[PDB]
Symmetry: C2
Subunit: 89 residues, 2 copies
């Protein structure tokens, strides 16, 4: 029932990654009704700018994978958050 | 293999919704390494403000459902895009 199971339902992922990751899956569904598309590159843009700012990720670690189909589009975005907190002063 | 199948693998939905919907699933995974959270309410905020602006949705049609678990958090957000393009002039 819980998605957390399907997303990580691949046995035990033991071992410490020592890092952070982000997997944002967008599923936009639009009915024949309505026109003028402009939502896919909209969310991605805000995320690319927000993450680059709010998060410490270089456009070099940004994985993009768009998938369009009829009136259904799905943008798979996976970002790997690096580590560099460094001690205090 | 394709997610589009699992997401809509519920027989044929048929029938025209005459509307648009958005289902953004966020799956943040962080290893014991690192501290000071602040990522879940970060993406949601930018989305709530971006959508309210870039998209025509009232905070009344915003469905929020957070789900935390150990070092894994999943925020399920579903927005229903209304219709009101109206003819031209």
């Amino acid at each position: 029932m819980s998605l957390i199971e399907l997303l990580f339902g691949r046995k035990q992922k033991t071992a410490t990654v020592a890092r952070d990751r982000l997997q944002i899956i967008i599923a936009q569904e639009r009915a024949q009704e309505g026109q003028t598309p402009d939502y896919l590159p909209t969310l991605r843009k805000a995320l690319m700018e927000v993450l680059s700012k709010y998060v410490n990720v270089s456009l070099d670690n940004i994985r993009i994978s768009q998938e369009k189909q009829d009136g259904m589009d799905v943008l798979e975005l996976n970002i790997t958050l690096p580590e560099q907190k460094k001690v205090l002063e």
